């Protein structure tokens, strides 16, 4: 789920950047580093909206790299357990659905897909369908899923979906 | 702490001068911009002393008080004796 929150970060400036235009370089450095990154604590970091305050440079002992704390508001995306969310089915397999929730990859195992659905690799797109084909889940379809599991791997979160209770599945 | 009333001395201490000069000399040695003009000086210490005499060192001294508060003085705000 998308949050807007305030964060703290410290940047070590190579000395070449002292002078006029320095703060703009500081902001651009923050943009370069933190955007696109993902943290198990705050979930994925969508983008840095605004920099509230630039803390005063502190000179470290030796190595002279000046150190700037930056307070900044940014957009992050962090799901939670039991959250129902819109997701997109990017690829299908006999094991289950690999879907994408914005930046996040989410998995729905075969047991978490309801019993009515059988895997048909033979379909022109491999898909999931009932014997009647009434409800057919294939690639690019929009679905609603509960996040029943979240797991952090190398700062990158991927989730586990479930379609059990009512009002879930094809949209 | 009220910056309008700073209780510490308006003079730069010998230790403040020493550390400010060393810090600024290291900054110059690491290719920081110089705030004063230069005739032929290439030693960072000489450049830092020239900047201190000119009152053009971009450093703030954060003097801590025993109670825990602090007072921020610009190097240009202090009285340089030596």
């Amino acid at each position: 789920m998308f949050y807007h929150i305030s964060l703290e970060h410290e940047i070590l400036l190579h000395p070449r950047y002292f002078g006029p235009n320095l703060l703009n370089t500081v902001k651009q450095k923050l943009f370069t580093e933190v955007e696109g990154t993902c943290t198990g604590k705050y979930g994925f970091v969508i983008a840095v909206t605004t920099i509230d305050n630039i803390g005063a440079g502190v000179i470290q002992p030796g190595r002279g790299f000046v150190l700037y704390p930056v307070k900044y508001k940014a957009i992050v995306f962090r799901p939670f357990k039991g959250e129902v969310v819109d997701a997109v089915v990017t690829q299908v397999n006999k094991v289950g659905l690999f879907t994408e929730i914005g930046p996040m990859s989410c998995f729905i195992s075969r047991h978490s897909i309801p019993s009515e659905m059988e895997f048909d690799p033979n379909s022109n797109p491999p898909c999931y369908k009932t014997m009647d084909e009434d409800i057919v889940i294939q690639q690019d379809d929009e679905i609603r899923l509960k996040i029943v599991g979240t797991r952090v791997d190398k700062n990158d979160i991927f989730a586990i979906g479930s379609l059990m209770d009512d009002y879930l599945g094809l949209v | 702490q009220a910056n309008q009333k700073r209780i510490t001395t308006p003079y730069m201490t010998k230790y403040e001068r020493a550390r400010v000069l060393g810090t600024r000399a290291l900054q110059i040695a690491m290719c920081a911009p110089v705030m004063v003009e230069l005739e032929g000086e290439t030693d960072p210490l000489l450049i830092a002393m020239k900047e201190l005499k000119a009152r053009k060192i971009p450093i703030i001294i954060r003097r801590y008080l025993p109670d825990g508060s602090y007072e921020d003085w610009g190097v240009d705000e202090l009285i340089i004796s030596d």
Binding site: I54, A56, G57, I59 | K56, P58, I61, Y70, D72
Partner: peptide, 16 residues
Amino acid sequence: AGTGCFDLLLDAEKCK
């Protein structure tokens, strides 16, 4: 003690 009884901060408004 001595040179360690205080901190130094960079003056962003004066580097201009």
